[PDB]
Amino acid sequence: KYDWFEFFLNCGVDVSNCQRYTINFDREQLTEDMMPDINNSMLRTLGLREGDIVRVMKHLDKKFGR
């Protein structure tokens, strides 16, 4: 099972939100292979705060060379 908590922490998300977002990603069946498909709309659907959407997308864009 993918460690979403570590991923959010590495994005600079605050520890409380890391817990909440991990619960949500796990429940909603998000996996590592889906990371290239993640966009702002989806993160908003998954309940991320606007600041955290920015942080996570900045990380993913850097990861995937965008």
UniProtKB/Swiss-Prot annotation:
Cellular localization per UniProt: Nucleus; Cell membrane; Endosome membrane; Cytoplasm, Cytoskeleton, Actin patch
Domain of life: Eukaryota
Post-translational modification: Phosphorylated by PRK1.
Function field: Component of the PAN1 actin cytoskeleton-regulatory complex required for the internalization of endosomes during actin-coupled endocytosis. The complex links the site of endocytosis to the cell membrane-associated actin cytoskeleton. Mediates uptake of external molecules and vacuolar degradation of plasma membrane proteins. Plays a role in the proper organization of the cell membrane-associated actin cytoskeleton and promotes its destabilization.
Entry similarity comment: Belongs to the SLA1 family.
Subunit-level organization: Component of the PAN1 actin cytoskeleton-regulatory complex. Interacts with ABP1, KRE6, LAS17, LSB5, RSP5, RVS167, VPS1 and YSC84.
Something else known: Present with 952 molecules/cell in log phase SD medium.
Record protein name field: Actin cytoskeleton-regulatory complex protein SLA1
Natural source organism: Saccharomyces cerevisiae (strain ATCC 204508 / S288c) (Baker's yeast)
Phylogenetic placement of the source organism: Eukaryota, Fungi, Dikarya, Ascomycota, Saccharomycotina
Boundaries of the shown chain within the full protein: 654 to 719 of 1244
